[PDB]
Design an enzyme around this catalytic site. Sequence first.
Site, PDB file in Angstrom:
ATOM      1  N   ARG A 123       0.823  -1.179   0.000  1.00 61.67           N
ATOM      2  CA  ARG A 123       0.000   0.000   0.000  1.00 61.67           C
ATOM      3  C   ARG A 123       0.874   1.251   0.000  1.00 61.67           C
ATOM      4  O   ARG A 123       1.702   1.423  -0.913  1.00 61.67           O
ATOM      5  CB  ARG A 123      -1.029  -0.097   1.133  1.00 61.67           C
ATOM      6  CG  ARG A 123      -2.005  -1.253   1.022  1.00 61.67           C
ATOM      7  CD  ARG A 123      -2.670  -1.589   2.351  1.00 61.67           C
ATOM      8  NE  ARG A 123      -3.162  -0.383   3.011  1.00 61.67           N
ATOM      9  CZ  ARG A 123      -4.391   0.116   2.891  1.00 61.67           C
ATOM     10  NH1 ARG A 123      -5.322  -0.501   2.173  1.00 61.67           N
ATOM     11  NH2 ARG A 123      -4.703   1.233   3.530  1.00 61.67           N
ATOM     12  N   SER A 154      16.658  13.751   6.150  1.00 56.46           N
ATOM     13  CA  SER A 154      15.318  14.130   6.588  1.00 56.46           C
ATOM     14  C   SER A 154      14.554  12.947   7.060  1.00 56.46           C
ATOM     15  O   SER A 154      14.906  11.782   6.756  1.00 56.46           O
ATOM     16  CB  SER A 154      14.561  14.924   5.501  1.00 56.46           C
ATOM     17  OG  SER A 154      14.119  14.112   4.467  1.00 56.46           O
ATOM     18  N   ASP A 178      -2.057  12.344   9.847  1.00 57.40           N
ATOM     19  CA  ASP A 178      -3.415  12.079   9.439  1.00 57.40           C
ATOM     20  C   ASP A 178      -4.103  13.439   9.308  1.00 57.40           C
ATOM     21  O   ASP A 178      -4.088  14.227  10.246  1.00 57.40           O
ATOM     22  CB  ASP A 178      -4.090  11.191  10.501  1.00 57.40           C
ATOM     23  CG  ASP A 178      -5.531  10.772  10.126  1.00 57.40           C
ATOM     24  OD1 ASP A 178      -6.328  11.580   9.591  1.00 57.40           O
ATOM     25  OD2 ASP A 178      -5.881   9.596  10.372  1.00 57.40           O
ATOM     26  N   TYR A 184      -6.131   5.692  18.479  1.00 60.14           N
ATOM     27  CA  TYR A 184      -5.503   5.955  17.178  1.00 60.14           C
ATOM     28  C   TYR A 184      -5.259   7.474  17.072  1.00 60.14           C
ATOM     29  O   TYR A 184      -4.157   7.916  16.724  1.00 60.14           O
ATOM     30  CB  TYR A 184      -6.395   5.439  16.013  1.00 60.14           C
ATOM     31  CG  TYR A 184      -5.867   5.871  14.686  1.00 60.14           C
ATOM     32  CD1 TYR A 184      -4.725   5.267  14.121  1.00 60.14           C
ATOM     33  CD2 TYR A 184      -6.469   6.959  14.028  1.00 60.14           C
ATOM     34  CE1 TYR A 184      -4.212   5.716  12.908  1.00 60.14           C
ATOM     35  CE2 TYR A 184      -6.007   7.393  12.810  1.00 60.14           C
ATOM     36  CZ  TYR A 184      -4.872   6.794  12.266  1.00 60.14           C
ATOM     37  OH  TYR A 184      -4.420   7.310  11.098  1.00 60.14           O
ATOM     38  N   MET A 239      -5.020   9.699  19.427  1.00 60.84           N
ATOM     39  CA  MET A 239      -3.980  10.056  20.386  1.00 60.84           C
ATOM     40  C   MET A 239      -2.601   9.868  19.802  1.00 60.84           C
ATOM     41  O   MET A 239      -1.766  10.745  19.968  1.00 60.84           O
ATOM     42  CB  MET A 239      -4.167   9.299  21.698  1.00 60.84           C
ATOM     43  CG  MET A 239      -5.316   9.908  22.528  1.00 60.84           C
ATOM     44  SD  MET A 239      -5.824   8.743  23.815  1.00 60.84           S
ATOM     45  CE  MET A 239      -4.409   8.904  24.839  1.00 60.84           C
ATOM     46  N   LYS A 298      -1.758   9.621  16.620  1.00 60.19           N
ATOM     47  CA  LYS A 298      -1.472  10.523  15.512  1.00 60.19           C
ATOM     48  C   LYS A 298      -1.244  11.946  16.006  1.00 60.19           C
ATOM     49  O   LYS A 298      -0.439  12.613  15.452  1.00 60.19           O
ATOM     50  CB  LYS A 298      -2.574  10.460  14.390  1.00 60.19           C
ATOM     51  CG  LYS A 298      -2.518   9.058  13.663  1.00 60.19           C
ATOM     52  CD  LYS A 298      -1.160   8.859  12.977  1.00 60.19           C
ATOM     53  CE  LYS A 298      -1.194   7.748  11.939  1.00 60.19           C
ATOM     54  NZ  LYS A 298       0.110   7.427  11.336  1.00 60.19           N
TER      55      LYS A 298
HETATM   56  N1  LIG Z   1      -4.884   4.665   3.996  1.00 65.00           N
HETATM   57  C1  LIG Z   1      -5.309   5.890   4.342  1.00 65.00           C
HETATM   58  O1  LIG Z   1      -6.235   6.357   3.739  1.00 65.00           O
HETATM   59  C2  LIG Z   1      -4.697   6.677   5.483  1.00 65.00           C
HETATM   60  C3  LIG Z   1      -5.420   7.673   6.160  1.00 65.00           C
HETATM   61  C4  LIG Z   1      -4.865   8.392   7.213  1.00 65.00           C
HETATM   62  C5  LIG Z   1      -3.560   8.121   7.615  1.00 65.00           C
HETATM   63  N2  LIG Z   1      -2.858   7.142   6.969  1.00 65.00           N
HETATM   64  C6  LIG Z   1      -1.484   6.896   7.402  1.00 65.00           C
HETATM   65  O2  LIG Z   1      -0.657   6.675   6.260  1.00 65.00           O
HETATM   66  C7  LIG Z   1       0.347   5.646   6.572  1.00 65.00           C
HETATM   67  C8  LIG Z   1       0.376   4.480   5.592  1.00 65.00           C
HETATM   68  O3  LIG Z   1      -0.978   4.118   5.313  1.00 65.00           O
HETATM   69  P1  LIG Z   1      -1.430   2.622   4.878  1.00 65.00           P
HETATM   70  O4  LIG Z   1      -2.935   2.578   4.847  1.00 65.00           O
HETATM   71  O5  LIG Z   1      -0.630   2.189   3.682  1.00 65.00           O
HETATM   72  O6  LIG Z   1      -0.986   1.799   6.181  1.00 65.00           O
HETATM   73  P2  LIG Z   1      -1.533   0.314   6.549  1.00 65.00           P
HETATM   74  O7  LIG Z   1      -1.706  -0.498   5.287  1.00 65.00           O
HETATM   75  O8  LIG Z   1      -2.674   0.441   7.554  1.00 65.00           O
HETATM   76  O9  LIG Z   1      -0.230  -0.229   7.331  1.00 65.00           O
HETATM   77  C9  LIG Z   1       1.096   0.005   6.854  1.00 65.00           C
HETATM   78  C10 LIG Z   1       1.998  -1.096   7.394  1.00 65.00           C
HETATM   79  O10 LIG Z   1       2.194  -0.917   8.795  1.00 65.00           O
HETATM   80  C11 LIG Z   1       2.746  -2.125   9.277  1.00 65.00           C
HETATM   81  N3  LIG Z   1       2.335  -2.398  10.669  1.00 65.00           N
HETATM   82  C12 LIG Z   1       1.097  -2.353  11.217  1.00 65.00           C
HETATM   83  N4  LIG Z   1       1.162  -2.690  12.536  1.00 65.00           N
HETATM   84  C13 LIG Z   1       2.454  -2.982  12.835  1.00 65.00           C
HETATM   85  C14 LIG Z   1       3.224  -3.450  14.015  1.00 65.00           C
HETATM   86  N5  LIG Z   1       2.640  -3.655  15.209  1.00 65.00           N
HETATM   87  N6  LIG Z   1       4.564  -3.651  13.831  1.00 65.00           N
HETATM   88  C15 LIG Z   1       5.191  -3.416  12.643  1.00 65.00           C
HETATM   89  N7  LIG Z   1       4.560  -3.006  11.500  1.00 65.00           N
HETATM   90  C16 LIG Z   1       3.216  -2.809  11.565  1.00 65.00           C
HETATM   91  C17 LIG Z   1       2.148  -3.258   8.439  1.00 65.00           C
HETATM   92  O11 LIG Z   1       3.237  -4.062   8.013  1.00 65.00           O
HETATM   93  P3  LIG Z   1       3.215  -5.653   7.675  1.00 65.00           P
HETATM   94  O12 LIG Z   1       2.215  -5.563   6.569  1.00 65.00           O
HETATM   95  O13 LIG Z   1       4.654  -5.910   7.323  1.00 65.00           O
HETATM   96  O14 LIG Z   1       2.717  -6.409   8.887  1.00 65.00           O
HETATM   97  C18 LIG Z   1       1.399  -2.511   7.324  1.00 65.00           C
HETATM   98  O15 LIG Z   1       1.531  -3.107   6.029  1.00 65.00           O
HETATM   99  C19 LIG Z   1      -0.013   5.123   7.941  1.00 65.00           C
HETATM  100  O16 LIG Z   1       0.862   5.772   8.837  1.00 65.00           O
HETATM  101  C20 LIG Z   1      -1.447   5.581   8.165  1.00 65.00           C
HETATM  102  O17 LIG Z   1      -1.888   5.798   9.511  1.00 65.00           O
HETATM  103  C21 LIG Z   1      -3.392   6.439   5.927  1.00 65.00           C
END
Ligand SMILES: NC(=O)c1ccc[n+]([C@@H]2O[C@H](COP(=O)([O-])OP(=O)(O)OC[C@H]3O[C@@H](n4cnc5c(N)ncnc54)[C@H](OP(=O)(O)O)[C@@H]3O)[C@@H](O)[C@H]2O)c1
Lengths: 248, 248, 239, 249
Positions: free
Chosen positions: C12, C134, C140, C153, C155, C157
Amino acid sequence: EAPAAVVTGAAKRIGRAIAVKLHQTGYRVVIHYHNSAEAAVSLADELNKERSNTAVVCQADLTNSNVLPASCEEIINSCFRAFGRCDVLVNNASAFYPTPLVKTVETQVAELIGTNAIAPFLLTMSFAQRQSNLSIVNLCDAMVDQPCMAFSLYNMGKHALVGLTQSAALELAPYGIRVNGVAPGVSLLPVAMGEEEKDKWRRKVPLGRREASAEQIADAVIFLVSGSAQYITGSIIKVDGGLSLVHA
Amino acid sequence: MEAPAAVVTGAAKRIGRAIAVKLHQTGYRVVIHYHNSAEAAVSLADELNKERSNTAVVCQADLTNSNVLPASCEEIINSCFRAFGRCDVLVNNASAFYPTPLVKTVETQVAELIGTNAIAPFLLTMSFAQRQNLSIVNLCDAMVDQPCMAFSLYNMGKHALVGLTQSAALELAPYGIRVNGVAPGVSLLPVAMGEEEKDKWRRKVPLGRREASAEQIADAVIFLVSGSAQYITGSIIKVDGGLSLVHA
Amino acid sequence: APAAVVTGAAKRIGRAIAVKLHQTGYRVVIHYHNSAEAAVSLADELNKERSNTAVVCQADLTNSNVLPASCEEIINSCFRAFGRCDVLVNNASAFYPTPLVKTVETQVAELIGTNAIAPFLLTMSFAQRQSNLSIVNLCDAMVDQPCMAFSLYNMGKHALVGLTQSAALELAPYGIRVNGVAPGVSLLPDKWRRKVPLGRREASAEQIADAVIFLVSGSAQYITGSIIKVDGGLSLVHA
Amino acid sequence: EAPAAVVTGAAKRIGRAIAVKLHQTGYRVVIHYHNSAEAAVSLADELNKERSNTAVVCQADLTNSNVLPASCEEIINSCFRAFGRCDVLVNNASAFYPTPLVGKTVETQVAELIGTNAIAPFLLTMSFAQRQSNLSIVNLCDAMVDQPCMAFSLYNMGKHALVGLTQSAALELAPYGIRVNGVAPGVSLLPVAMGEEEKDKWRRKVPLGRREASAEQIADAVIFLVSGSAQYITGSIIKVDGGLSLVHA
Ligand SMILES: NC(=O)c1ccc[n+]([C@@H]2O[C@H](COP(=O)([O-])OP(=O)(O)OC[C@H]3O[C@@H](n4cnc5c(N)ncnc54)[C@H](OP(=O)(O)O)[C@@H]3O)[C@@H](O)[C@H]2O)c1
Ligand SMILES: NC(=O)c1ccc[n+]([C@@H]2O[C@H](COP(=O)([O-])OP(=O)(O)OC[C@H]3O[C@@H](n4cnc5c(N)ncnc54)[C@H](OP(=O)(O)O)[C@@H]3O)[C@@H](O)[C@H]2O)c1
Ligand SMILES: NC(=O)c1ccc[n+]([C@@H]2O[C@H](COP(=O)([O-])OP(=O)(O)OC[C@H]3O[C@@H](n4cnc5c(N)ncnc54)[C@H](OP(=O)(O)O)[C@@H]3O)[C@@H](O)[C@H]2O)c1
Ligand SMILES: NC(=O)c1ccc[n+]([C@@H]2O[C@H](COP(=O)([O-])OP(=O)(O)OC[C@H]3O[C@@H](n4cnc5c(N)ncnc54)[C@H](OP(=O)(O)O)[C@@H]3O)[C@@H](O)[C@H]2O)c1
Ligand SMILES: O=c1c(O)c(-c2ccc(O)c(O)c2)oc2ccc(O)cc12
Ligand SMILES: O=c1c(O)c(-c2ccc(O)c(O)c2)oc2ccc(O)cc12
Ligand SMILES: O=c1c(O)c(-c2ccc(O)c(O)c2)oc2ccc(O)cc12
């Protein structure tokens, strides 16, 4: 053909670096100016020597008055007249001087609220009414919540410009027009300023103890109009070297 | 005499009225400023004077931006000194509010929306300060960063008001004048507004699914002017039932 | 050639980030917790393009007595593989509801640990071990209009915003910039799509990565403590 | 009956001033404390001598651990055990010290600075709401959270999380009639170990009077937020900083 941009207050300093960098990216440019006629014509000449027929100048006073809407309409019209399109508006022109609470007050209001807030709004209106990667970038101020003592009207104007950036991003998104801001902290210090005072200000910046170059501000503007910012609207990018993070 | 005095702008009706009543109940003498609502302003003054003689006067003034606005603002503040020999509190409550789509002439819309919401408060603040538990309370808006569609000028003016609240607080703190804001979310809904439309708004408020009463807004004003807020300046208290926390 | 660590890089958004960094000429550590096959598949695709420019690194980023050692190791793997570490992207994230009315302390460990504490520890390790350096933190955009029942969550962020600012201030003397990218709705985990002003759709992961690429680039050399929203105007929309 | 309030870290300083003002307004109070046992009992004795059976003490470490949820549950229980109700929660307890990025282990710093400032408020909020008139929670925030002191990243993280909690909880608890708000001091009582010279350096930066907030001034904003005068306010953080957060570098 190539896209076109209007940059307000583009004769000197940050506006000039923004017009230069848009031009280097492939844009044809309107170089808006008020008093800096020689500097403006000079920049348009240099840009035109690089790529013929890609730069014009447009003179206008952006002080608030009953004819300000016509002046702003004419700035945008000058883009279409020279280039047949207008893809980018950069609201960069700005009046900046103290207005202590304790030039008549009507003039100070007309200048500081006009240039910083009302002219942006009217230029935005005229831009949108004439309408691809369309976008408007407003030059904001990273220090708007930690203002310079006695700069109430200036501060009011830049706060109003934030309001505009948000409101226009919301209202113009269905027309595919994005609206964002770039907020300098300390960048090019005022010409009037003494060197010891310039240094006072430099020393406060966490990242390098130096003001932003005009090109570093321009670089954020370039990003915001670019294809790499196509999902970005209503955002304001601080380009301030951490200065807004520093407590009293 | 020994009772303090307050100016409330737009005090004939609705929130301004409740603010004037509550201040009067707290022991303040009051200038009830109005623009068109003469009959309402006079009846409030008569009701207040029946409670305590010689404690309320009215003052008519248009707060639209123009050449004469500074003189109007000066005269509003003067009115309080002529009536009561002192002026302890300024409440900037008067507001124009109506849509201004990007896509009345526009310069009139600017005069009214930016004059009432921002310029007049700045000019009243200058006159209040130049004439000196002193404080100023500005009526802000809790939804300023999630604004209603096509309200850019109104949004600009209310953001400009935040700016003024911050700048004036910083600048006036050496004189012991505090400057704060109260930011309603949905309070008293428009007069003509259908109940079905009012309900749409009410249903969005997490706390009780209802709009704030005018008295609830006045309560936050009374706090900020009180001895219980003696260290508070530059703060804006939302009184919005959690409305601004609700995502789309 | 500079080197970058990206956490949660197997899928992703972190994947899009790794690819784009690699395409810009970075060597990359692809960190993963449970997604081994995917991390290795990505490393293989990047090494086919340019050999020995992509390695994987396993670590659990849950808060625990050993999280500091796991974070140190992630940073170490970059230095081992490539001899430098120029860019840290804190992308890994746990996301799920925690109603006020898994044990609660496990939810704390995951939601605060992954989202805020690991970023903090990785930041310390990255800094200790140190030019265009950097750190980019994935924030978020809807942090002030949070989803109902997502307190922990939110908190985490908000804590991450606190870290972005504090670290930008503290590391500025070292020439380390610290910034944030704040997606709105990006890759879903139609109703949400409909609320977005700009085109009634979610951000692709590449749009998120584009903001990350700007922030690590020479075009952002003066930018620190800034959080760029990439949300299509979603955070401007009232209830 | 009189309403009842829990004040965390209420033996001394701002926490005490809030418990005293609450008590003077007519509340019965639970004075939570961690190490300050003598000061806590002493405060409850003074408050009980004004009105009998209106103050109790309650000891707990608010550092994060697997038992923190039980300790928070127990604090709230102590109010119900003592007074039969719990109307107000003031999350005031706070660890505060530098954690530079470049004695205590890092895991202990995280547990204390994140635990006391954010995780305990969250768990006490869960307990306060689950154990359920004018109900509200007030969180002691920090006006300078966006212009942080150098090398205090964990403390700043914790206070930012507390802002997040204030907003998330206000929103989730609004349907239950529970308001959640914050009071954010700039500089109020200086640290006991700070030298006068450093104190005056901080004082001198405050626009409004060049002095720190008194404990009472902070308490006044708390009193407001729990009062009937704030019945429509939820999710608001009132700065009480004399302008400090407006002052540029
Ligand atoms: N998707 C959105 O629309 C959205 C919205 C707001 C904020 N964000 C922020 O954008 C960033 C990336 O988004 P995303 O949706 O691509 O993230 P995601 O798919 O929810 O997770 C990204 C990766 O985090 C790793 N992860 C989760 N829990 C973990 C743990 N306990 N230890 C180690 N690794 C862990 C997982 O790795 P593994 O797969 O290797 O287990 C997962 O593939 C995140 O920080 C998210 O909060 C995204
Ligand atoms: N420089 C900084 O450190 C800094 C910090 C914060 C924000 N900013 C913002 O960044 C942008 C650029 O900064 P800058 O320092 O380059 O700006 P500047 O030199 O102060 O002003 C730029 C131009 O605005 C034009 N202007 C002034 N009054 C005008 C009027 N009544 N009508 C039309 N144009 C008028 C002038 O044009 P002529 O020369 O043609 O008369 C001037 O050259 C501004 O919006 C500013 O507020 C700058
Ligand atoms: N009610 C809400 O839900 C809400 C929401 C957010 C913010 N606010 C803010 O809270 C404050 C009070 O709200 P409200 O709903 O009670 O206000 P309102 O009824 O919309 O207006 C207050 C008064 O403003 C005066 N006014 C309007 N245009 C004027 C002009 N050109 N010159 C002088 N006075 C003028 C009018 O006086 P006359 O009647 O004498 O002409 C009017 O009665 C306002 O600042 C408003 O923006 C209210
Ligand atoms: N003082 C200021 O100028 C200022 C500025 C910004 C924010 N604030 C905030 O305002 C609130 C009050 O400030 P203050 O200076 O009065 O607070 P403080 O004296 O620094 O701390 C208050 C109490 O926190 C409790 N505490 C510390 N670690 C604990 C733990 N592990 N478990 C349980 N309790 C613990 C202590 O109780 P014991 O004494 O019983 O051990 C301590 O007396 C705090 O939330 C603070 O962060 C204050
Ligand atoms: O040149 C400017 C400047 O140095 C600064 C400036 C100087 C020192 C500071 O600490 C600061 O925050 C801004 O502000 C400007 C705002 C508007 C404008 O048109 C020009 C300037
Ligand atoms: O009456 C108003 C109003 O209901 C509202 C209002 C109604 C519904 C909303 O959701 C909202 O955010 C504001 O705003 C006003 C702003 C200024 C003013 O002078 C009056 C009003
Ligand atoms: O005592 C404190 C203090 O003076 C300050 C303080 C002192 C000087 C400052 O310029 C400031 O911003 C905070 O912060 C605290 C934060 C938490 C806490 O528990 C106690 C203090």
